């Protein structure tokens, strides 16, 4: 299956910030994990949306925004991460990347 143009742009950016970032990503900011599921992009978007101190993620966030059909707002306080667990942004990003990467392993 060939690559959505907007999609490989996201894959690239993800790759960059995972590969290129020197110190930890967003310095000990810990976010909610995700699964290769359904609202995946939004989920990701929501999960990132919360970290505020970090610029490295803002492009990624924007990128993700195009993928989510509805508006995601920061601090939508809820018990919806019942199945998810808190992880380092660095690791979060990478997972996302792999999952996206995997869609194209035929």
């Amino acid at each position: 299956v060939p690559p959505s143009t907007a999609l490989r742009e996201l894959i690239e950016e993800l790759v960059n910030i995972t590969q290129n970032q020197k110190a930890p990503l967003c310095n000990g900011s810990m976010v909610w994990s995700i699964n290769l599921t359904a609202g995946m992009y939004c989920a990701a978007l929501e999960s990132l949306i919360n970290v505020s101190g970090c610029s490295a993620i803002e492009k990624t966030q924007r990128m993700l925004s195009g993928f989510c059909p509805h508006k995601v707002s920061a601090g939508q306080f809820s018990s919806l991460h019942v199945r998810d667990t808190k992880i380092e942004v660095a690791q979060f990003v990478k997972d996302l990347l792999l999952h996206l990467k995997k869609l194209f392993r035929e």
Partner: protein
């Protein structure tokens, strides 16, 4: 152990055909069912036994199963086919397994204006020493809205609780905002307004006390 995987999103222009893949090792070796689930509804079956379609389901639905991928094909892709779609099987070891599911979207729905309806604190509520204004927004698309409340043409930041929009049965979006006030605050001002921005256009309904 055994897990089926689907891409979590697929877009098609309307009428033109749609393809959803479900992958797993030796998937052709079992029977694949496909379920359709729309926002806030239980899942409905559309395909079973790889390729059988139950009574009810339009003919544009079809599925094959081959070695390592199963594919749900929707030819003549329609608006009302927008949904989350799941593959499901049975495995000796792990039994009933389900894929991640995939979120299908038909491309190029035309922009749609919101329908704001704003209610004032009920007489009961006020009588109870509470007060809530109720700002209900229906039928808009894309699913993106900014709500803001004004107290005598002055922004009210605190006491707002607003939902993140959600897909309506008709594939537009619905959201609602609620403002909590002390009966003093509510009686004190001339009026209050919630104001909804949906893509450049704004609708501002206002309401005032007796």
């Amino acid at each position: 152990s055994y897990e089926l995987t689907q891409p979590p999103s697929v877009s098609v222009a309307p009428g033109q055909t749609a393809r959803i893949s479900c992958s797993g090792d030796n998937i052709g070796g079992t029977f694949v069912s496909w379920y359709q689930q729309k926002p806030g509804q239980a899942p409905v079956l559309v395909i079973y036994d790889d390729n059988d379609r139950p009574s009810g389901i339009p003919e544009r639905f079809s599925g094959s199963n081959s070695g390592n991928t199963a594919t749900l094909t929707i030819s003549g892709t329609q608006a009302e086919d927008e949904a989350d779609y799941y593959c499901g099987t049975w495995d000796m070891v792990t039994n009933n397994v389900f894929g991640g599911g995939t979120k299908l979207t038909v491309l190029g729905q035309p922009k749609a204006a919101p329908s704001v309806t704003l209610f004032p604190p009920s007489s009961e509520e006020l009588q109870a020493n509470k007060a809530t204004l109720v700002c209900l927004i229906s039928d808009f698309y894309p699913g993106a809205v900014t709500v803001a409340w004004k107290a005598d043409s002055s922004p009210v930041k605190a006491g707002v609780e607003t939902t993140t929009p959600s897909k309506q049965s008709n594939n537009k979006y619905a959201a609602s905002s609620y403002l909590s006030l002390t009966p003093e605050q509510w009686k004190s001002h001339r009026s209050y307004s919630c104001q909804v921005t949906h893509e450049g256009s704004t609708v501002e309904k206002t309401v005032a006390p007796t």
